[PDB]
Amino acid sequence: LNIADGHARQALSPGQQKIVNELPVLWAESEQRPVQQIESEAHQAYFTLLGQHGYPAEPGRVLSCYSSSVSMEILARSLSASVDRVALVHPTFDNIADLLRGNGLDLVPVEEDALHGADLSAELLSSVGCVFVTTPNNPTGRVLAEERLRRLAEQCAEHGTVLALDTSFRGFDAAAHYDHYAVLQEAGCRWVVIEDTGKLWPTLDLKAGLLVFSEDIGLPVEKIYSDILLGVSPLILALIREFSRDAADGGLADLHAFILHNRSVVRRALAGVEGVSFPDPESRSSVERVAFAGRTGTEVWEELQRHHVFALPCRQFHWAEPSDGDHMVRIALSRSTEPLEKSVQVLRTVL
Amino acid sequence: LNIADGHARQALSPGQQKIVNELPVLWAESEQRPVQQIESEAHQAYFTLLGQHGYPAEPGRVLSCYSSSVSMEILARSLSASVDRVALVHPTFDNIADLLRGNGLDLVPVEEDALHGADLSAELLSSVGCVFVTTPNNPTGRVLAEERLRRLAEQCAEHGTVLALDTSFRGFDAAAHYDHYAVLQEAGCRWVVIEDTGKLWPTLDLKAGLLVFSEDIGLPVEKIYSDILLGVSPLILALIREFSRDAADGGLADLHAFILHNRSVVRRALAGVEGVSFPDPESRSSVERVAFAGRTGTEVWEELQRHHVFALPCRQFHWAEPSDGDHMVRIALSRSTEPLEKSVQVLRTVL
Numbered sequence: 001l002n003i004a005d006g007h008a009r010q011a012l013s014p015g016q017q018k019i020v021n022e023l024p025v026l027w028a029e030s031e032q033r034p035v036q037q038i039e040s041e042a043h044q045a046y047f048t049l050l051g052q053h054g055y056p057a058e059p060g061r062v063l064s065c066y067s068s069s070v071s072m073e074i075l076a077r078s079l080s081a082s083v084d085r086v087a088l089v090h091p092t093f094d095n096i097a098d099l100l101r102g103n104g105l106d107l108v109p110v111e112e113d114a115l116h117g118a119d120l121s122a123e124l125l126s127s128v129g130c131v132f133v134t135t136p137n138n139p140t141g142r143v144l145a146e147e148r149l150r151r152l153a154e155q156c157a158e159h160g161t162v163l164a165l166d167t168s169f170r171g172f173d174a175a176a177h178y179d180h181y182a183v184l185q186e187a188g189c190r191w192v193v194i195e196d197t198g199k200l201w202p203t204l205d206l207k208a209g210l211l212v213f214s215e216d217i218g219l220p221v222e223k224i225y226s227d228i229l230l231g232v233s234p235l236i237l238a239l240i241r242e243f244s245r246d247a248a249d250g251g252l253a254d255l256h257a258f259i260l261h262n263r264s265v266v267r268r269a270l271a272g273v274e275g276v277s278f279p280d281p282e283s284r285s286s287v288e289r290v291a292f293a294g295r296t297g298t299e300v301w302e303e304l305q306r307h308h309v310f311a312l313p314c315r316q317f318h319w320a321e322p323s324d325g326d327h328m329v330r331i332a333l334s335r336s337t338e339p340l341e342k343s344v345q346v347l348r349t350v351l
Numbered sequence: 352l353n354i355a356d357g358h359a360r361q362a363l364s365p366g367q368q369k370i371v372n373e374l375p376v377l378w379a380e381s382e383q384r385p386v387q388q389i390e391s392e393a394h395q396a397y398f399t400l401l402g403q404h405g406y407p408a409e410p411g412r413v414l415s416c417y418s419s420s421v422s423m424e425i426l427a428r429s430l431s432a433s434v435d436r437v438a439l440v441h442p443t444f445d446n447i448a449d450l451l452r453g454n455g456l457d458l459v460p461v462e463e464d465a466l467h468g469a470d471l472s473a474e475l476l477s478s479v480g481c482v483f484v485t486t487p488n489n490p491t492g493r494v495l496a497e498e499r500l501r502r503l504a505e506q507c508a509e510h511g512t513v514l515a516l517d518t519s520f521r522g523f524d525a526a527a528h529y530d531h532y533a534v535l536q537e538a539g540c541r542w543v544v545i546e547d548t549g550k551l552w553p554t555l556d557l558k559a560g561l562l563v564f565s566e567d568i569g570l571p572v573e574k575i576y577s578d579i580l581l582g583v584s585p586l587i588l589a590l591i592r593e594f595s596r597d598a599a600d601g602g603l604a605d606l607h608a609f610i611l612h613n614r615s616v617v618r619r620a621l622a623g624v625e626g627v628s629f630p631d632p633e634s635r636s637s638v639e640r641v642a643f644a645g646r647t648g649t650e651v652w653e654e655l656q657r658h659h660v661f662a663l664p665c666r667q668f669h670w671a672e673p674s675d676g677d678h679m680v681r682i683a684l685s686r687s688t689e690p691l692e693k694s695v696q697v698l699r700t701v702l
C-alpha cells in the first residue's frame with residue numbers, strides 16, 4: 001500500500017489502453033519517420049493540451065530529456081559557472097535542493113507566503129543569480145498566479161536574475177494552464193522552464209523532461225544537454241503525443257475528476273480525527289499534505305510502516321528548516337482508489 | 352542517408368519484430384510485477400549474454416540509469432568529491448571527457464598504445480585518483496585484453512586508484528566477452544563499470560545505462576544516483592531482457608555477421624580509392640573510421656552533406672588534441688545495407 005511516490009500507479013483508461021495496444025504501430029512510425037517530426041508533434045500536443053500555446057516551436061528550443069531530474073541536473077550545472085546563490089521556494093521537492101547544492105549552488109529559501117503574496121525584496125533579487133519556483137508546487141499544490149509570474153519575471157529581468165520554473169505538476173491544475181510562455185516572453189527576463197510528462201499518466205516511467213529556455217538565457221544548457229544526450233526515444237515521444245491527444249479528447253477532464261475523487265476519499269476518511277487538518281485546501285495536485293498536532297510526521301510514518309503503509313514525512317520538503325515539516329505527512333493520490341482508501345483507513349486507526 | 356550516429360537503425364530481425372509485437376503484453380507484465388524482479392531478470396540476461404557472469408547480482412549493486420551518459424554524469428560528479436585528476440583513454444567518445452571536465456576533473460590523456468602496451472607509470476599513478484578506459488573503444492574498436500585489464504586493476508589497487516570502465520560496445524566484439532568482474536574482484540581495486548544496452552539493437556533509444564561498482568568504491572555514487580532518478584521504466588528493462596534472450600538465441604551471432612557484412616561493404620567500396628586507408632583493421636565495432644590523405648575530415652563531411660549524406664568528422668574524439676583526427680571520418684555500420692551502400696558510393700566519388 002504505497003502512498004509515497006508521486007508517480008501514477010492507477011490503471012490505464014480505455015483510451016490509454018488502446019494506445020498501449022497499438023505500441024507496435026507507434027514503433028513502426030518511429031522507425032519510419034524523422035524523430036524531429038514526431039518530437040514536434042509530441043511537443044505541440046503536450047504544450048497545446050495544457051494551454052502553453054506560445055511555447056517556442058522552432059526545433060531545438062525545446063530539449064527533450066529522459067526526465068525532469070535530468071533536465072534539472074543540466075540546469076544546475078549550467079548555473080554553477082556564473083551563479084553562487086539560488087533563491088529556491090521552500091518547501092519544495094527536496095531533490096531540487098540536492099541537485100542545486102550538489103552542483104555547488106548555495107540556496108536561499110523563499111517561503112510561499114512571501115513568494116505569492118508580495119514582490120520579492122530587491123535585496124534578495126540582487127543577492128541571487130537565479131530564482132527557482134515549482135508551480136504547481138510539490139508538496140503544497142500552490143500555483144503561481146499569472147500576475148505574480150509576470151511581476152516575478154519582470155523583477156528578475158530588472159535584476160539580471162534568471163527565472164527558472166519547474167512545471168511538472170502543470171497538467172493537474174487548470175489554474176496553471178494560462179500561457180506561461182506568453183508571460184515570460186513578454187517580461188523578457190532570462191528564463192528556463194522544465195516541463196515534465198512523467199507525473200500525469202501511468203506510463204511506467206516512460207516520460208520526458210522538457211527543458212525550455214529563452215533565446216538569451218546566457219547559460220550553457222544546450223551544450224551540457226548535448227553532453228548528456230542526443231534526444232529521447234521517438235517511441236516515448238509518440239507515446240506522449242498519443243496520451244496528450246487522448247487527454248485533449250476528454251482524458252484530461254477525466255483525470256481531474258479522478259484526482260478530485262481520490263483527494264475527497266482522503267479528506268473524508270480523516271476529517272473527524274484529532275487534531276488533523278489539511279494545510280492546502282485548494283490544491284488540485286496528485287499529492288496531498290496532512291497535518292496533525294501532538295505527534296510528529298516521522299512518528300506517524302514509522303507507525304504506518306509497521307502496518308505496511310508507506311507515506312512520506314514532510315521534513316524532507318522543508319529543505320532549509322526540516323523541523324518546519326515535523327507535523328505533516330504527504331500522501332500520493334495517483335493511485336487506484338481501492339488501494340488508496342485502504343491506506344488512509346490504516347492511517348485513521350493509527351491516529 | 353545518415354551514417355553518423357552510432358545507434359542502430361537497421362531493420363528488426365524476425366525475432367525482434369516478434370518482441371515488438373508483444374509490447375502490450377510486456378506492458379501488462381510491467382504493471383503487475385515488482386520492478387526489482389524485472390530489473391534483476393534484465394540484468395541477468397544482459398550480463399550473462401555477454402559473459403559477465405561474476406557481475407554482483409545483489410540488488411542495488413547495479414544501478415539502472417536512463418543511459419550510459421547519465422551513468423557517466425553520476426560517476427563524474429561522484430569522482431569530483433574526492434578526485435582531482437583522471438587519466439582517460441585518448442581518443443574516446445568526447446562526452447566522457449566533456450562530462451568529467453564539466454564536473455571539475457582534470458584529464459590526463461593516455462594514448463591507446465600506452466594504455467594497452469605498457470604498465471601505467473608510477474609518475475602517472477601518483478598524480479591521478481582514477482583511470483578511465485572505454486573498451487571496446489569508440490571510435491577505434493580497440494579491446495582492452497584480459498591480461499592488461501588485470502595488470503591495470505593490480506596497479507590501481509596498489510595505488511588506491513579507482514579503475515573505471517565504459518563497456519557500451521561490449522556486445523559487438525567477442526574479445527570483450529571474458530568476465531571483467533572476476534578480474535576486477537580478483538585484483539581488489541576500487542572499480543566502476545558502465546555497461547550500456549543502447550548501441551547493440553535497433554530499439555529506438557529504449558535502453559539503460561548500468562552503473563556497477565565495488566563495495567569499497569568510496570565514492571558517493573549511490574547518493575548522487577538517488578538524487579537524479581529512482582530507476583528506469585520496467586517496460587524498458589523487460590525489453591532489454593527479451594532482446595538479450597533473443598540475442599542469446601542466435602541474434603548476437605547474426606548481428607556480428609551483419610556488422611561484418613556492412614564493414615566489408617564499406618571497405619569494398621573504398622580501399623582502392625586514393626589515398627584511403629582504414630585505421631582499425633581489426634575492429635569489430637558498429638562504427639568504422641576511414642582515413643584519407645590530402646583533405647580534411649571536416650571537408651569530406653561538407654561535400655557529403657551536399658549529396659545529403661551525413662557522416663562524422665573524427666576531430667571530436669581526440670579530446671586532448673583534435674588535430675590528431677583531422678584526416679578521418681567515422682561511418683555508422685548499424686544501418687540497412689542498401690542506404691549504407693548508397694552512402695559509401697557517394698563518399699567514393701567524392702574522394
Ligand SMILES: Cc1ncc(COP(=O)(O)O)c(/C=N/[C@H](CCCNC(=N)N)C(=O)O)c1O
Pocket residue numbers: 004005006007067068069070093134137138166168169196198205287579580581582
Ligand atoms: C516538482 C518535481 N520536479 C521534478 C521531479 C523529478 O521527477 P523524475 O523522477 O525525474 O521523473 C519531481 C519528483 N517528484 C517525486 C517523484 C520521484 C520520481 N518518481 C519516479 N518513480 N520516477 C515525488 O513527488 O514523489 C517533482 O515533484
Ligand SMILES: Cc1ncc(COP(=O)(O)O)c(/C=N/[C@H](CCCNC(=N)N)C(=O)O)c1O
Pocket residue numbers: 228229230231355356357358418419420421444446485489517519520547549556558638
Ligand atoms: C563509449 C560510449 N559511452 C557512452 C555513450 C553515450 O551513449 P548514450 O547516448 O547516452 O546512449 C556513447 C555514445 N556513443 C555515441 C552515441 C550518440 C547518442 N545517440 C543517441 N541517439 N542518443 C556514438 O558513437 O555515436 C559511447 O560511445
